[PDB]
Amino acid sequence: ITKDMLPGPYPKTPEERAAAAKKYNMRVEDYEPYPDDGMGYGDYPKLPDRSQQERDPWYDWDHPDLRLNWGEPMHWDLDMYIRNRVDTSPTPVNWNLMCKHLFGFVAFMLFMFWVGETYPTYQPVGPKQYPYNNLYLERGGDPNKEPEPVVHYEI
Amino acid sequence: GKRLFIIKPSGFY
């Protein structure tokens, strides 16, 4: 590799834009850079942020797992839009509709568990009754002190 | 019959 195929600074003149689009091996009309706010992207082409999962799978690819060709200017986040990672593919249900259904479902189930914790169900019984002063020596009571009498009666 | 050759890398080394 040599210098005139390497990235450079932001294209200002249209002939530098044409030289870059010839360098990045794409049409000049499709070639748009990242906007020169000073974030250091340089003259790299702003690809339209499509995940590689979205591509044609039956197409004869150079890189079949990446769904990518030789000499094609890759996406800037190509390490991010691999099929092991972030996807942007279309879904059968809308994005905001998914977020609304998920948030309503999760928050409503949380609220219903809070309602059921507010109002607990039980059995029509008294408490469970244990002998020997509510099992005082079994539950770790000291042998020198003597507790109050816990006496249960027949019924 | 009709035994097929399985291409694999060198397991010798």
Add this chain to the structure above:
Amino acid sequence: MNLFSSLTLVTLILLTMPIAAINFNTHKFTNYPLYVKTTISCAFITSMIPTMMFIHTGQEMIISNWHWLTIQTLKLSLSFKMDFFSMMFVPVALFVTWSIMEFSMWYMHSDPNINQFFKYLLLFLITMLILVTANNLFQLFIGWEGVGIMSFLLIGWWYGRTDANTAALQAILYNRIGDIGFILAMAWFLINLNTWDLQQIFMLNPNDSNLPLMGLILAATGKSAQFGLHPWLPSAMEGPTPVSALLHSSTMVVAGIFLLIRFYPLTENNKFGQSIMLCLGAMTTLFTAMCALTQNDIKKIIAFSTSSQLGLMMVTIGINQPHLAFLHICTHAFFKAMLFMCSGSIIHSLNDEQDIRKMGGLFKAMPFTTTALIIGSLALTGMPFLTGFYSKDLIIESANTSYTNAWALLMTLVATSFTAIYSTRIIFFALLGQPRFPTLININENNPFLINSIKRLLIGSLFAGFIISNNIPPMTIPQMTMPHYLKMTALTVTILGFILALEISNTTHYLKFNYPSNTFKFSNLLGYYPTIMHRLTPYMNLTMSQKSASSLLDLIWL
């Protein structure tokens, strides 16, 4: 005494001996899968003797045999806890694994890496019986991370496939999010109790134990696929069928449930931990059973089945009934491993066909597979006096008759109905009706490996609940007095689920085409939860991992 501890260690050393055999190899093997299956059969026979002499007297012990480290007040020794939980889990795990490997000698016969497969499956078994026998938190963390890594290696078995690697990394991600809470629990016990040993944790018996139990509940969420950290267990069906049968149905995925059953003296004195376990388990057993109603891949449906059963296990821990939960683990292993084995027998017979919409007519084509699939489904739903009756129904017989979150009970009953719904859905689309698979029939099951491997778990799925529940001692008091509408709850709800799903299945023969409802789109796209968070949380990481982390700060400003 000298018999118990000796055969206890002989079981684990015997499981490790084929790993030394496969690592010290020069020849090509005289059927190394048969060698590992013979070894695990004999390890089952070996572990039967300590279980029988535990059922005789109740003999528990600890083998703290090798001193490993002493960090100034913390003596980390190699310590094996042989209690009721190990004595009931080790023969069940070895029996299930022995059936899975006799299954795998048929199913995985075309794989040229069959010795690596049986090696990895034995490594999983070794790490799992390290997990369930560990007496301190460190050896349990060894087995914990071991079953996580062997889960990675057995999901990504076809490592060329992108989806298998994706699902394996997904499972590692959710398990390490659970490991955040496990390490939180280890940190709390080391700082406040000066121990990782279970005995000093139980003897000190702390009262402000909300934070370590929240850590353990997050660990069981990461491990047993509870809600929030669940979708890796349906994603993990991309691995082979005996992987999903052994690991991700019956053996690995109960380890978060086993972690919470293991710490029962802390949960029985913390009502807040019981309430959080009850709410999370009811949420998971609702959600995964609801997602199972509208799926078409049979491995996905049985994975949602096992995750709903794990949510029910979390429910019955959350009502402070841990021994019923562990009886449900030992029960659930048999019929759920058998259901995955019969589904994979259908898959391998129908030439790698897993979608239930291209099955059917297999009642008389695969008769033994149909018999065992019906027996596994009926043990799952709670048919009277199969194995799944002897725990799950009792769970409902303690979920009704206790001081319980009422909505958790109602969602538990809705889950109990949904189990019957997806079970007869599997029997409808896969066994009943007329065929839908392609035209070149290669349907066959007449291998003694497959038939005997399903047969021994069939004997288990028929008799094992009766045998175990009449061989285990009482550790709680079984609540046996309730009104007749409350005693007949689980059976009636299960039969109502069968009736509702038979009406649903007989609405499919009608010549009508309806537009999809919002409930169908919700349950079919998995509550929209793997669709959003698997896109959003990586995105908000990785752009933040590139724009501000790499480019802005650590290449320009700093």
Add this chain to the structure above:
Amino acid sequence: SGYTPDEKLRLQQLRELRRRWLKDQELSPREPVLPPRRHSIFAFTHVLIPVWIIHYYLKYHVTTKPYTIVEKKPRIFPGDTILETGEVIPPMKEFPDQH
């Protein structure tokens, strides 16, 4: 429309070459040319010798050290006979029978 005659010709030529390659992936009856290289020994090598090793280890190295193998003491019921002493545990109180 289907293929062009150029595409049909190319697919036929490539198909002939592909079938020749796949047919020539076959094996000879000598191939592979390999270089020139007790009924229950399983229970002896894998069980009995490890039971010997682990019994020697637990009997002379583990139990000879304190608190390494700690065992829960056995469950004592009313009516039992103690082997270390010879003492018979007395029974329970007589039952206020219910049935």
Add this chain to the structure above:
Amino acid sequence: AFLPSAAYLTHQQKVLQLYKRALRHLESRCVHRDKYRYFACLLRARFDEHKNEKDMVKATQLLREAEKEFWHGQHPQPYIFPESPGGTSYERYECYKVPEWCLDDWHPSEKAMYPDYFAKREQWKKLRRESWEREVKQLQEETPVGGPRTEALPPARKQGDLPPLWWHIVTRPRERP
């Protein structure tokens, strides 16, 4: 849209692909075979109602709201074939598809284990290397100025020659190694 030979989709191809995807998603909706076959002839009638539409702008609009119909009525998890992309057995054996040049890196003690195979592989490689310069000088005189317009390659024209760019298509790994 994105194709190797054509730069676009013709309207006829768009109609056929939408008909096929509609039938596949319909079969996903309509599991049973007689029921799907009934609705399949109904949908074939719906597609043949406007088969004879001459106006390509009106057919464009009808195809567009037909795509809206198909998107409104699609199944969320349609039946994907197992070795089709998105299937359960898709690209499963790609970890077993070793490229052929790795046979060149074998040791001679295991090359001698299969003598006839490598003795034939030598003349396969001989065939490739005496075909290469002829097919390069074939491609350099047929390709127009500016490079080739479409990705399709010409066949073998002379007798005795081989088609250009043929070695990786012929010697590709089997789909079940």
Add this chain to the structure above:
Amino acid sequence: SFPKYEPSRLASLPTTLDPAEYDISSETRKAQAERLAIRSRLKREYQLQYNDPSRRGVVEDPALIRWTCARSANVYPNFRPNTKTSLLGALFGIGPLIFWYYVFKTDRDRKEKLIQEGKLDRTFNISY
């Protein structure tokens, strides 16, 4: 009529429901033909090196080399400190550091005040 599909950042619009896919104009024919021409030329330039027997090595891809040089080297020499770069390097640069600083300082002052007042249960805490 029908619910229109809403595109998103992580849910792109399909190829079928986009209107500009249904362009029939000759300038779209020219753009599609030039894209097919560049793609075919790059495909040919690749697989003449790929199918070459005399080459045994790596067909170097200057788009990949250009991508890595953009992701590593071109970050500093095309930086300009302005309002946007300084404010975004002050938000995610010294923001969460200050956040976790005050959180951990608050919790440690609370814990120290509870320890020197005899409040914190530091009973069995002898490993540290």
Add this chain to the structure above:
Amino acid sequence: DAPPLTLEGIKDRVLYVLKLYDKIDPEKLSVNSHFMKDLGLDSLDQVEIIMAMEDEFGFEIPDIDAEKLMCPQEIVDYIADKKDVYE
């Protein structure tokens, strides 16, 4: 399991499918019968025939190849390409 496919088997199965099709007569059907020109079928019928091939053999033919298969011999040759027959 997984039985080997042969050109006799692929040929006989493709012709067996097309002889169960009510717009193709079983007496004019040959191995080189063109669908549009010789058997007089529609492109819709051709898409249904390629989908019947997908139903028959248990895999998918993509549309860039489904738009060009215009005889049973092209179908047998395409399945021979995608299944590696006569090893």
Add this chain to the structure above:
Amino acid sequence: MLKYIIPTMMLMPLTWLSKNSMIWINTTLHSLLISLTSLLLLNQFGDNSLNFSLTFFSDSLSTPLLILTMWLLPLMLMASQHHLSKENLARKKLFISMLILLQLFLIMTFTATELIFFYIMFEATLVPTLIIITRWGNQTERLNAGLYFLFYTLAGSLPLLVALIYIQNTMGSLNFLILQYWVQPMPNSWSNTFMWLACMMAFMVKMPLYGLHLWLPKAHVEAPIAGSMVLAAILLKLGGYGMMRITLLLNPITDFMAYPFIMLSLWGMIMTSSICLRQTDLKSLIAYSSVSHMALVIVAILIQTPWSYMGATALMIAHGLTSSMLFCLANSNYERVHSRTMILARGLQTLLPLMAAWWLLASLTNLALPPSINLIGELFVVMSTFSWSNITIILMGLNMVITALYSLYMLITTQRGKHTHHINNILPSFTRENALMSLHMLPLLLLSLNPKIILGPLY
């Protein structure tokens, strides 16, 4: 310590008087004999350090770093001998001489009884490393790193020099043994604040610190394999060793001067680990992993509990072995595909199964799989920082998710998936390369059996 310095110096007449085909074999043999000799330093005591002379001593902190240093030289001679095959013989002997001189500087850097001899040897280790990186680095493009080395000299080693001369005038000595018993508390003052920054910032850049890690994914990239091995394995750990010596004098002001830098590490390991998820360069990914692991050692030294020092020195030894093996795996692919791009050569388990086994083992040690000493160090640091503050477990555990995430991604990208078609020079694994991976991994696995020799002076 003079039974180790003199054989290391006798490796110079051994490497210059050796026959031209024998200079790798002889230096590898005698450096392996020195590494076998290096186990005599395990004569440690529970109360006293092993004090040889007025000039050299060894507690249980310096001893494992010495054993790792004397073990690292044969591995560097194995790793760097392939890509120096077409080199001149005299230049090859100059390379081996700079490696031997770096070991010579290090093994009396770790044993330095007095702190200004530690400073001289500490800043002496930079020169052979500099010459190795810039004469055998295969490309040199250091337009931004010159100004950063100027920043290292200004903000780092020179205030350390002035501070150590000040302690020499105040205390009367810089013997660490004397400073154990003559240490005065360093109270709150501005003089003592600049004193703390002078004593700490050199070692902060040497670890490296987050925000100060700008040199490390450059100097690791532009280096040969032996340079990257000694940077990852030893030369970062000089900062941690120097912090564990110099924080004796910095009490109790450390108890409120640690709070900024702890934040810089606790958030910093969240960032750099995340940075490893977006690395195109594999060697840069291993560099940012080294930053993400040395952040925990910075926190564990600054919180100065016993469990934190035990975990920090165990993490230093374990990460030295692990990251050196990771750079050697990265080179074992770079010597074939001739590019460091991680997405270039994929699916390598189809081609190299045993090397993919080594990738799997180095990844599992990288993500701290128990009972490996990576996990023991990681875990003890996490316990001690929980004792520091109970919220930090979140910033620990989240790191322990992302540390897993890039560890397997590096495994999944390079070894799994579909192999790259147009790369056909992927040779089978040379026995040298597999021997290098095993001499990394098998000591790292054997140290799980007996970790007490790598847990420092207060085990």
